[PDB]
């Protein structure tokens, strides 16, 4: 796991080639590339939405057409084997390509992108092959009926698009595309990846400001005004492109009704209004979602720990996803078969109304929790009138989907747990509204669609412990400003009550790989956490030493006692053995001469003194995108060097 030098070199050749462009088309190209990132991320979101809609429509039409045929004849056992096989055939195809070709495209990409924006480079995270495999794999994973979502993998897809088109070079088609030539640093590419992950969040939920605050949480740096204004531009382009194309697919072009991939609706119907006296009630919900999120993360920790040791061959972790894909169908059919309540039409509240043993004008209502998208089930657990749900079928769908969503997340498929967490939470929140509207009688403040929202926020905050960006996504996705005050209380409590037990879902899976991962602040002076065998280098260095020092310490400070003069990298020494260092930028490759590296080295590296405290050396290293920090004496003698592996330990 290598780092990226987000601090720029600023050598003699950077200062010379900074001239003859100021002697301003570089700033225009950045806005052009950010507009391209927004358009391409919105179009990939449209492609996923359309293909998933049509393929899942075909599958549910085939499966429904075989249940309705076998009901009066009597062969319903052969209709279970159709849906146990149609699920196990899409998931078989969508898991061979993840286990055998690219295992970095497994799960949601949010831990990998979250480690990229700190600076850790997981080796194959932003290639084109990862984009192809993750897009087709999330399609085959959603169609094949796993208890997963599809909005989580939009962040990784958008940031892979952003790392791809910013370089202007494919490195997969063996092409050059002599157009950009300037944005091939690690200080530019990390900013473009930040804009792409923001556009991914914006198309995933319909919330551009939440995507900006997502990309500002990770990559905690100094404030850059123009960078955040480009990031906001890319997020707006992303939401607009998704909405504009999904309007002209439904054949209206005027309404623009779908800003993101999930659309919560409008929360202003005068039954939605809350009051101050139920502000304690919401706090109680934040405790319940903090307990249940800890149970989810604990049960998922003890299963990933099983799977790392015992199920790690690629053939043997394709077979596990096939069995989980068959078992979700089996448990769904068993709960559909044995249920009792039936229901007439409510105007498209089912979308595939299955009459199984009902009364010929009614339809089975356990089969409506299944056979829908989880999106439509969440949108209908909000906004429905009271009396719409039986507490037995809803509470038995809730209990089962919890364990199906907990047993599915560590699989080797492309997937996500936003929409599972929102559906687990909106279900017991809707049950909470039922018991409140039963205790108080037919009240008005006891609206179950108001408490389904607070339960979804509580469960999503308890599982994914994430507050500042998720609150803004919630407050913007419901389009009500007065709702942010209960929601951010609910997300505060669910963090606190969660963090006493277990870590957090995206953080536990960062820790379960040996990843450095600098945190927000320090949990000691610089003399304790440095590295004294530093092995510095002379300005007029006799070569032959350089090929022996280089043949683990990617950065070498340049000295001469021995006074500090600057830093040199491993890559620039190989290139010497400003457009040549950037030409050879992807994938860096007697004895007597002399090498005078006086015009290639960083002339002013950041240095901390020997007595400086740990929250001071950690503040500069985390905000400035540093990978090396020199510790000097009082006579500017270099003793010790601070890298990320020195700071990520404590």
């Amino acid at each position: 796991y290598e780092s990226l030098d987000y601090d720029n070199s600023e050598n003699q050749l950077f200062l010379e080639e900074e001239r003859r462009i100021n002697h301003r088309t570089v700033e225009i190209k950045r806005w052009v590339i950010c507009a391209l990132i927004g358009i391409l991320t919105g179009l990939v979101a449209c492609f996923i939405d359309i293909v998933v809609e049509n393929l899942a429509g075909l599958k549910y039409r085939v499966i429904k057409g075989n249940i309705d045929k076998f009901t009066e004849k009597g062969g319903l056992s052969f209709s279970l084997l159709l849906w146990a096989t149609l699920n196990a055939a899409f998931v078989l195809v969508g898991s061979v390509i993840v286990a055998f070709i690219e295992p970095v495209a497994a799960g949601s990409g949010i831990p990998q992108i979250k480690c990229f924006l700190n600076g850790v480079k997981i080796p194959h995270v932003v290639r084109l092959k990862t984009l192809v495999i993750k897009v087709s794999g999330v399609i085959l994973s959603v169609v094949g009926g796993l208890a997963v979502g599809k909005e989580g993998p939009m962040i990784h897809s958008g940031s892979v698009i952003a790392a791809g088109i910013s370089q202007g070079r494919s490195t997969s088609l063996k092409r050059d595309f002599k157009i950009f030539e300037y944005f091939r640093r690690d200080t530019e590419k990390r900013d473009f990846v930040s804009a792409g992950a923001a556009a991914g969040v914006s198309a995933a939920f319909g919330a551009p400001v939440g995507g900006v605050l997502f990309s500002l949480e990770e990559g905690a740096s100094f404030w850059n005004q123009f960078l955040t204004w480009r990031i906001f531009f890319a997020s707006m382009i992303s939401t607009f492109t998704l909405n504009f194309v999904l309007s002209i697919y439904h054949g209206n072009m005027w309404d623009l009704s779908s800003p993101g991939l999930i659309n919560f609706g409008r929360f202003d119907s005068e039954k939605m209004a809350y009051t101050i006296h139920e502000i304690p009630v919401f706090i109680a919900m934040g405790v319940v979602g903090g307990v249940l999120g800890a149970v989810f993360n604990a049960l998922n920790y003890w299963l990933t720990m099983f799977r790392i040791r015992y199920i790690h061959r690629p053939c043997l972790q394709v077979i596990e996803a096939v069995l989980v894909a068959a078992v979700t169908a089996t448990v769904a059919f068993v709960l559909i078969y044995s249920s009792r309540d039936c229901q007439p039409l409510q105007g498209g509240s089912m979308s595939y109304p299955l009459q199984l043993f009902c009364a010929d004008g009614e339809y089975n209502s356990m089969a409506a929790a299944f056979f829908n998208t989880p999106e439509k089930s969440v949108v209908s657990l909000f906004h429905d009138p009271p009396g719409s749900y039986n507490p037995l079928t809803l509470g038995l769908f809730t209990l089962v989907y919890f364990f199906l969503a907990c047993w599915t997340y560590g699989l080797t498929v492309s997937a996500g747990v936003f929409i599972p967490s929102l559906l687990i939470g909106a279900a017991w929140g809707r049950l909470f509204g039922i018991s409140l509207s039963y205790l108080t009688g037919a009240a008005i403040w006891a609206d179950p669609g108001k408490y389904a929202l607070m339960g979804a926020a509580a469960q999503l905050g308890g599982i994914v412990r994430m507050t500042l960006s998720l609150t803004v996504i919630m407050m913007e996705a419901t389009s009500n400003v007065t709702y942010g005050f209960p929601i951010m209380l609910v997300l505060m409590t669910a963090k606190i009550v969660g963090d006493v037990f277990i870590e957090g879902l995206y953080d536990m899976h960062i820790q379960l790989q040996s990843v450095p991962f600098l945190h927000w602040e320090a949990p000691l002076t610089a003399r304790e956490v440095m590295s004294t065998p530093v092995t510095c280098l002379r300005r007029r260095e006799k070569v032959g030493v350089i090929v022996d020092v280089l043949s683990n310490h990617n950065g070498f400070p340049v000295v001469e006692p021995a006074r500090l003069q600057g830093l040199i990298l491993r890559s620039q020494l190989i290139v010497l053995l400003l457009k040549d260092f950037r030409d050879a930028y992807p994938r860096f490759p007697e004895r007597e001469c002399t090498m005078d590296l006086s015009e290639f080295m960083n002339p002013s590296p950041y240095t901390v003194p020997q007595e400086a405290s740990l929250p001071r050396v950690f503040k500069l290293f985390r905000a400035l995108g540093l990978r090396h920090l020199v510790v000097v004496d009082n006579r500017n003698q270099v003793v010790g060097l601070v890298t990320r592996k020195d700071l990520a330990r404590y």
Binding site: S77, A84, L316, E320, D360
Partner: protein
């Protein structure tokens, strides 16, 4: 005093005392055929004469229609149009809106056969479910044919939905006709086999 400020001129008065005769009769027909729902087939011509007598005067359209803050002749024809569209009485009528559709006249004939077979095949209700089931199946299949044919253009007509509601509620409850469905042993035998495969996979890969 000039016309239209205190009173009305008698021609445009007589175009108000005529529309008043057609709304009273239409409200009477609507409530008299309200509950045994014969709505779209009894007074379609009364709705036609009201929607004709409205446009008789819309083209003194200002001496009657736009002269108050509460426009009685305007907001009452909007009631009649909203009720006629919520009923979907266009489905029970032709393209010319002059007679019943060729499909509805075949439904309401077949519905009469089913209700005259129910009350005749009766002396329990263990004889009604036999020898009468062939009528219920063809009636329900015809209904589901009409429903998708109406879906091809974009609720059915309320005159035929109420007939199908009455005969489904008369068949399912109050007669308790049902099918046996001896199918709960092979489903249990298969769904106990598939749920057993994960505890074989997790246990074989733990040992070996």
């Amino acid at each position: 005093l000039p016309p239209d400020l205190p009173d009305l001129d008698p021609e445009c008065r007589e175009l108000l005392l005529d529309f008043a005769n057609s709304s009273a009769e239409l409200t009477g027909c609507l409530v008299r055929s309200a509950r045994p729902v014969r709505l779209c087939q009894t007074c379609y011509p009364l709705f036609q004469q009201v929607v004709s007598k409205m446009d008789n005067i819309s083209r003194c359209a200002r001496s009657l229609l736009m002269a108050d803050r509460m426009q009685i002749v305007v907001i009452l024809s909007e009631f009649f149009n909203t009720t006629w569209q919520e009923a979907n009485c266009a489905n029970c009528l032709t393209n010319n809106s002059e007679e019943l559709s060729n499909s509805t006249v075949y439904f309401l004939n077949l519905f009469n056969h089913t209700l005259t077979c129910f009350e005749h095949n009766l002396q329990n209700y263990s004889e009604v479910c036999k020898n009468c089931r062939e009528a219920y199946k063809t009636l329900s299949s015809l209904y589901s044919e009409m429903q998708k044919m109406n879906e091809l253009e974009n609720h059915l007509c309320i005159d035929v939905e109420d007939a199908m509601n009455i005969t489904r509620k008369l068949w399912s409850r109050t007669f308790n006709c049902s099918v046996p469905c001896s199918d709960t042993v092979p489903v249990i035998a298969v769904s106990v086999f598939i749920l057993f495969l994960p505890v074989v996979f997790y246990l074989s890969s733990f040992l070996h």
